[PDB]
Amino acid sequence: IKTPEDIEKMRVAGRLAAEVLEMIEPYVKPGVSTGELDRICNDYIVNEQHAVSACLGYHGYPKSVCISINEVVCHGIPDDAKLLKDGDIVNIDVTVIKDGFHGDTSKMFIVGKPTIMGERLCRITQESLYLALRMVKPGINLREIGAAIQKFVEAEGFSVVREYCGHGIGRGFHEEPQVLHYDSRETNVVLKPGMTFTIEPMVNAGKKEIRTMKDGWTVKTKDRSLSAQYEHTIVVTDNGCEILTLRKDDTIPAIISH
Ligand SMILES: CS(=O)(=O)Nc1cccc2cccnc12
Ligand SMILES: [Mn+2]
Ligand SMILES: [Mn+2]
Ligand SMILES: [Mn+2]
Ligand code: NA
């Protein structure tokens, strides 16, 4: 449970994280390397935002952002040799620390000519984040929120990745609680005002199972189906929530009141 002043620090950090995604958007084009995208992000964070990437060095992570293409579910490592191409779907997952507090958000970019199925998976995944956000208010259990995401996603013939989840966030990067995106008999966390955490559903076109690669980081779908993710950092309010990482292109308001 964060203090008013700490919540303010989270607004600042969350805005910065959102702004990295706004900044990078025009660079997300056929032909660019994920390596360069990462350099551009890191330069912006250090030099213009006077912040730091939370990811760089975190538990040994080598880069400043995670960039995940098509069948890669999460933790794609920027690389100078990996070029974006027409029809790709790409997640850029950003976390910045500013004044001791973390802001954590990601979105999908569609590269070149969108494919109908890429467009669909991306839209449905964002909608699954959106429906979750509209549920958030004190007195609700996280279990219900995980359950609703799962129900929505699967009704689309998609699946929810189980190995990854949203999380409490503040002066730490991945704090309690775990925010599962599916119904779990383990989840029992009733929301309270001032809690800050993320919601970050990872949705596969095919089966839920994943595979980790040999670089200690990159995760793909076991069946090599497409996978998409969107993420926001939020604070629970008296009556709902406030999205700390909102972007210009978000089709949901910052403050959600009940
Ligand atoms: C820093 S990171 O964005 O690459 N993410 C992570 C790093 C290290 C450990 C993690 C565990 C769960 C989820 N994300 C993790
Ligand atoms: Mn991560
Ligand atoms: Mn993230
Ligand atoms: Mn996160
Ligand atoms: Na993907």
Terminus-to-terminus distance: 20 Å
The run of helices and strands is HHEEEEEHHEEEEEEEEEEE
State which percent range the strand residues make up.
25-35%
CATH hierarchy, class: Alpha Beta
Stated plainly, the CATH topology is called: Creatine Amidinohydrolase
Mind telling me the C-alpha Rg? Answer: 17 Å
CATH H-level homologous superfamily name? Creatinase/methionine aminopeptidase superfamily
The CATH architecture comes to Alpha-Beta Complex
Structural class: alpha+beta
For the sheet with most strands, the description reads:
4 strands, antiparallel
Number of helices: 4
List the ligand species. N-(quinolin-8-yl)methanesulfonamide, manganese (II) ion, sodium ion
The total number of structural domains is 1
Helix percent reads 25-40%
Shape: globular
How many strand elements?
16
GO biological process, one term: proteolysis
Family: Belongs to the peptidase M24A family. Methionine aminopeptidase type 1 subfamily.
Keywords: Aminopeptidase, Hydrolase, Metal-binding, Protease
Subunit structure: Monomer.
